[PDB]
Symmetry: D2
Subunit: 267 residues, 4 copies
Amino acid sequence: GLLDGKRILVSGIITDSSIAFHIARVAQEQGAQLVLTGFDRLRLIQRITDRLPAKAPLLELDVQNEEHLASLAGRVTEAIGAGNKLDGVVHSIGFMPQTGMGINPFFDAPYADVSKGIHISAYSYASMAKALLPIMNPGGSIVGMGFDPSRAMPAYNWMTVAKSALESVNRFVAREAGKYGVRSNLVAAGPIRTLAMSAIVGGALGEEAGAQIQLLEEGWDQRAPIGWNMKDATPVAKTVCALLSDWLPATTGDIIYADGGAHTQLL
Amino acid sequence: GLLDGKRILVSGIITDSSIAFHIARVAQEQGAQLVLTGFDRLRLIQRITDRLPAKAPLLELDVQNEEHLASLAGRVTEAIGAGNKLDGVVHSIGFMPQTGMGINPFFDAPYADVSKGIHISAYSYASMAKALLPIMNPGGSIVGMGFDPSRAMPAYNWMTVAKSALESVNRFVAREAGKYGVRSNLVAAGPIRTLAMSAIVGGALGEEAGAQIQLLEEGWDQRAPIGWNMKDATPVAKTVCALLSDWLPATTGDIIYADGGAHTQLL
Amino acid sequence: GLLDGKRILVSGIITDSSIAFHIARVAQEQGAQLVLTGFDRLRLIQRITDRLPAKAPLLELDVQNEEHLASLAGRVTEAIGAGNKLDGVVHSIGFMPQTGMGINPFFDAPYADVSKGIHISAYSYASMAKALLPIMNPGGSIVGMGFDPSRAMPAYNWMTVAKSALESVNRFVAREAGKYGVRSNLVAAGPIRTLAMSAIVGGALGEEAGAQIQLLEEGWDQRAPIGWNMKDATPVAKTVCALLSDWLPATTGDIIYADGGAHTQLL
Amino acid sequence: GLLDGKRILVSGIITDSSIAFHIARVAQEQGAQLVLTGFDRLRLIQRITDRLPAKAPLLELDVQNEEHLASLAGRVTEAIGAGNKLDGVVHSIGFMPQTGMGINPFFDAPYADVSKGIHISAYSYASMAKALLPIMNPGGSIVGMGFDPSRAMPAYNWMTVAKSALESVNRFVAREAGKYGVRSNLVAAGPIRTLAMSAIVGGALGEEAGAQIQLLEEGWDQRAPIGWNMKDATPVAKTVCALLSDWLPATTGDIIYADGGAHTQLL
Ligand SMILES: NC(=O)C1=CN([C@@H]2O[C@H](COP(=O)(O)OP(=O)(O)OC[C@H]3O[C@@H](n4cnc5c(N)ncnc54)[C@H](O)[C@@H]3O)[C@@H](O)[C@H]2O)C=CC1
Ligand SMILES: NC(=O)C1=CN([C@@H]2O[C@H](COP(=O)(O)OP(=O)(O)OC[C@H]3O[C@@H](n4cnc5c(N)ncnc54)[C@H](O)[C@@H]3O)[C@@H](O)[C@H]2O)C=CC1
Ligand SMILES: NC(=O)C1=CN([C@@H]2O[C@H](COP(=O)(O)OP(=O)(O)OC[C@H]3O[C@@H](n4cnc5c(N)ncnc54)[C@H](O)[C@@H]3O)[C@@H](O)[C@H]2O)C=CC1
Ligand SMILES: NC(=O)C1=CN([C@@H]2O[C@H](COP(=O)(O)OP(=O)(O)OC[C@H]3O[C@@H](n4cnc5c(N)ncnc54)[C@H](O)[C@@H]3O)[C@@H](O)[C@H]2O)C=CC1
């Protein structure tokens, strides 16, 4: 069991096709005891998570809520029992109001909307770390979910800016986390057919967005020297588990690309 | 005259040691007619700018003000006369509340403070572009001021996150600006002894910040194969002018490092 | 056992402080059956490898020898028995004549000497892949050893050029290897006290080299948010094993930094 | 005149569609006195260069010839007159035997052929610098021609490896050149329809190469936010001249992308 004995907080389960859902599953299959957090439809999330191969306490956490962040460590040690600490934290949380993604022209997202997306998608990586490093073991691992934002791309727009900010935050959380003996890294994932992703290629945010995203994903699989299957989140899940394991013990402030190799190839 | 005939909006003059101040000066020495914008002490800025080798209208612009952004193009064509357009825009604007720079631990900047810095230092690059591309000529150039945020560094903290977001914004403004025949680029500058920079090495934001920044700059000059003189902004000024010229006509969404070569060298 | 059942060719064992030595050891501790290759002192290597926690056939391979490359696949399937294939190949081979490292000024390495180092240290990664992909399983993994060559550094000189070429070769072997269902990646390691490394800080290649390398390594541990211990190769060993495992199944043409996080940090 | 008064050695003119040809032309139009070097058809090159807007001495230089390198500085000061030095050197030289480009599979280039291409296309950048820095002024500029080798691409194959090595060499020549007050940089150009380029899209090196290159170039113009015209070398020429000028005085060991902005954009 890659993750035998480890206690791991996995955030961001919203449906059974969330990337966190699969991380959660592969983690349990691998020996880990989890605690889960969820955003706003908690009953829905409870019903979804009932399907993991094992039970796991579930706590509410709205990353924009000071008080939830304040109480989080208490709620976690309670759920895992006093005298116990986390070995692993997964941040798999993201959001950008739709005015910052694809419908709208890039220049028409208003600041209050982008600030919200940066808050939830980038800054919150620091918040979770701050809230949780006090309850983590030496040898621990924080892992966040990004996508390669180093070139601009159609439709993703401000969400790419948010991911750029996230990569930079991650390099700073690594500085803090290191004082605890704790690694911090991002997994840069290829596009994965989430419920929201599907809704977008179905045109949820306008037709030209839809067509652009669709063209983006097909290009991925073509460049990926080992292919990319957007229908299958589990190679990303496995990658996160590798970073939660003790098998990358000298990597931090870093980015692991689970993307089929697509970013290393031009045509 | 590198810039003969060009009309250029240069933002961000606050003292005679602002980097915009020198860009302004080198630009005039080079043939350009400028319009200047300033933030909040306009009388102060007027008195400062009186010293440039030529007169230049001065307009108020608070990058967080919708109405200033709204009116900006009107105020500019008025100042340069109807039927005239800009060839050049300089964004040399930045700010991060001090809770996000160095005193404070990284995890204690509150979101409202970082959001403010991201607003002024990153998002505003899109705002200026949006406000001004309607009044720019084919062959034009937007240039913003950054610093290399690809590795974390002590004290700069959230300001580095903000610069990471800026680089990503710049790649998107390039997409928009290209429809107008207009380039967008950043100059990544080495550390330069601005009034605020000095105040910080003098300990304005705590002693350990001060010492860290001071150590940062000395490392710069040591790595720079051609040296780096933080007392002298004019090699950065000249670099911005090169991007305003027609001599980099195939570069955009890009980053030019005016940093003595320091980023290309490890020890 | 991370590597249970896998058959793995590990090249480059020359002493018990070679990085391959530890990869070999951690791999065996982890379930793998190995075949080993060695360069020129085969009796010496046999005596060294006798110390691994398990036996492993040992084959001669001089990466500059056409005939050794020609025969290699035969010799390997013989050693592992017909009808069996490799799951894993480790390239941990490197060399640059000393005229290209540190004594000599950079401009005085003669081409014939640099060509030799590029041959052994970069091109040979393609050669091993070519010689061995015919005997590898879907799901396999080729892993080479590099160091981050993206900034120039004192003394390493042409060896850095060679590592730059290696990273680029690796992106091409990924293209080929993918047709076999096989990943190709590099581990970028922090400096590790090998016999040759020690000899150099002891001044083997001149005093100023020695002092520069020594300054390089101390800077590493200072930047590394989780520290770097050049005396201990085993975090690199573990990283290579992670890439040999099935836990990074969507990464290829890529670079994993086992370097304590040092490359993500400026000061 | 951007380059008024400067003396500049421009290498690599072979036809009137060579990139050096246009650099040469734009440089003269801009005030510079040139000395030119040529590889092996000197009479041909003389007849070609007769067309520049001004005369320029022409010297033979085969970058693989020790004796030509040995004598080069003598021949140059002779041609420019004793007591005079160079302000500018252009390296616009490249070659990879066709076994390393596109016909052949990547694994079938033999080392002796790749070594040749690395010799001419990468190592020679150090050679020219070594041969010429002794006859350069403070404030001088060495400029080489590359293409972005950071992702693998079809057909270019070993020539991409060679360009990877070149970028790394350039970071080392910057270290040496800095002791003379001299900058070293590369221009990364978009694809440009040279005679050899045309021959290749015409299938000179096999049909699938041809089709791949052709697909590569069309993708360039599509990503380039300001377009890319492979028929027109003069935006690259202008970029090189910008680096020869005094307008990028703090950039070295660096890479300027004259590529329409294509590398900053994913789809
Ligand atoms: N699906 C894709 O193609 C890729 C997604 N990613 C990233 O993976 C992560 C997970 O998203 P997916 O699983 O793809 O979609 P998802 O929609 O299943 O996950 C988004 C999670 O963010 C949570 N969330 C939103 N606002 C929140 C708040 N205020 N507090 C707490 N949680 C909040 C949602 O509840 C949801 O569980 C995101 O960072 C996404 O950007 C990275 C690469 C690719
Ligand atoms: N000084 C340094 O070592 C380096 C500075 N930079 C960047 O150069 C740019 C200029 O800063 P410096 O000249 O160094 O300092 P400075 O303090 O002279 O310039 C800052 C400018 O931002 C303006 N500003 C702040 N808030 C504003 C708002 N709401 N609206 C409009 N303007 C506002 C200020 O009025 C000031 O003119 C900034 O982007 C800075 O981050 C980049 C590299 C190095
Ligand atoms: N030690 C260090 O600080 C770092 C080393 N690396 C790389 O790790 C790899 C292994 O080197 P170390 O274990 O450090 O030193 P080492 O000297 O123990 O390993 C070098 C291996 O290359 C082999 N070799 C040399 N010429 C050969 C040829 N013609 N054919 C076959 N093999 C040949 C040697 O026999 C030796 O086994 C090299 O790629 C090195 O550049 C990467 C990062 C750091
Ligand atoms: N054409 C393209 O799409 C791009 C070309 N480049 C680079 O621009 C540079 C110039 O090539 P182009 O003008 O495109 O082609 P070209 O064929 O006109 O120039 C090649 C030059 O290399 C010279 N050369 C070859 N072997 C030599 C030797 N032993 N000694 C001295 N010179 C030798 C040739 O004589 C020729 O003048 C090369 O570095 C090329 O890789 C960079 C980006 C794009």
